[PDB]
Amino acid sequence: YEEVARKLVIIESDLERAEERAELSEGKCAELEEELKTVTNNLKSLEAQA
Amino acid sequence: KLEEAEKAADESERGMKVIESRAQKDEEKMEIQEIQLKEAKHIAEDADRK
């Protein structure tokens, strides 16, 4: 139980960090998506301007 | 012969008291060890379930 539950905790601690990486990377994905949309909206405003 | 027969009864009865008190101690200990075995096994089963 401790070997498997400790694997559950290790895998879960890696999971929390992988999930944290999913949240940090999703944070960046959303930030880059906001920047992408800001830059793409600027691109479209600048296509219209160009 | 009455003293021998009664003494055989009295001594076998004392024999019996010691080994009945032993049967009682062994019985209480086996019930305790059986309940503790059931619980140590139930903890093992609970730990196996866990």
Curated annotation (Swiss-Prot), chain A:
Induction: Induced in stimulated quiescent cells.
Modified-residue entries (Phosphoserine), positions: 13, 25, 45
Record localization: Cytoplasm, Cytoskeleton
Domain of life per record: Eukaryota
Family from the record: Belongs to the tropomyosin family.
Function statement: Binds to actin filaments in muscle and non-muscle cells. Plays a central role, in association with the troponin complex, in the calcium dependent regulation of vertebrate striated muscle contraction. Smooth muscle contraction is regulated by interaction with caldesmon. In non-muscle cells is implicated in stabilizing cytoskeleton actin filaments.
Miscellaneous remark of the record: The sequences of cardiac and skeletal muscles are identical.
Record note on domains: The molecule is in a coiled coil structure that is formed by 2 polypeptide chains. The sequence exhibits a prominent seven-residues periodicity.
Assembly, per entry: Homodimer. Heterodimer of an alpha (TPM1, TPM3 or TPM4) and a beta (TPM2) chain. Interacts with HRG (via the HRR domain); the interaction contributes to the antiangiogenic properties of the histidine/proline-rich region (HRR) of HRG. Interacts (via N-terminus) with LMOD2 (via N-terminus) and TMOD1 (via N-terminus).
Name of the protein in question: Tropomyosin alpha-1 chain
Gene assigned in the entry: Tpm1
